[PDB]
Symmetry: C3
Subunit: 106 residues, 3 copies
Amino acid sequence: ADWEDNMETLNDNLKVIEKADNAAQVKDALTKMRAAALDAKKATPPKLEDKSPASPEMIDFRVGFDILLWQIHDALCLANEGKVKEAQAAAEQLKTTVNAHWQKYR
Amino acid sequence: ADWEDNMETLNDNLKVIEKADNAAQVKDALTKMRAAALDAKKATPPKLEDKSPASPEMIDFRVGFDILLWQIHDALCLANEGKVKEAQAAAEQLKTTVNAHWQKYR
Amino acid sequence: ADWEDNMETLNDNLKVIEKADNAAQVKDALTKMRAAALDAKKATPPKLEDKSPASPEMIDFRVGFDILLWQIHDALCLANEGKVKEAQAAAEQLKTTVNAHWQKYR
Ligand SMILES: [Ca+2]
Ligand SMILES: [Cl-]
Ligand code: NI
């Protein structure tokens, strides 16, 4: 999946989490977010297509998904202990990061 | 260590987990798997020895080990809760990922 | 906010941890450490400034930060379970990883 599609997957599951009822839904959405973030590390945003795959710009891009992955880990750790409200609060901070990465590279 | 020896370490510890009797044994095996996966991320597998370390194929290889590392982390989270049987079930998914990586890159 | 400043942030929060009492203090210091390690992972350290960003040296540098990130995660897990003394013992060993990486690449 290209970068834009993976970002769409991230946002779709953020909405799933924000409207969620129980821990299971939150966990399944966070698991899909992790998979999308990892897949996006293999992608190239259109504006960086001319750059080296290991250029500092592309390193920045991939490590931005590492930042997201660690925030996803925190929310999923909260969700697996049944802390659904804390997991949703943390997902709200996930949306800020996702939006910032979207704005930076699109 | 080389990629192939890291892959042996992953397979060996998967067997350890399959037979494990308590949470400390599962945690220990998964910790060794994490070390081997991180070490393998610095390696070049046999299929990609004709590729540059910063080629897209090698970036994708390294992301594949990131994927493995996050699956290891899930099993380790179950084991840290003393849920031995759940963690062994999770390591079933690790086996699929490891075997797929073996077939793709050997 | 370059590599050297991140390594300083890592040492500062390590001192915060080694002189802490409750588990939330340790958690906050480890969370800032995680952020500093991730920022550093996208830097080029002084010793490698004359190397191609595609160099294997730079790949090894970045994987070394992944090793540090999982060590931070293990200490964070000990702290999230209330074992403040164990979190401080683990961070004692993080001190070595952090300062070794510092001295290696400065
Ligand atoms: Ca070669
Ligand atoms: Cl890379
Ligand atoms: Ni965790």
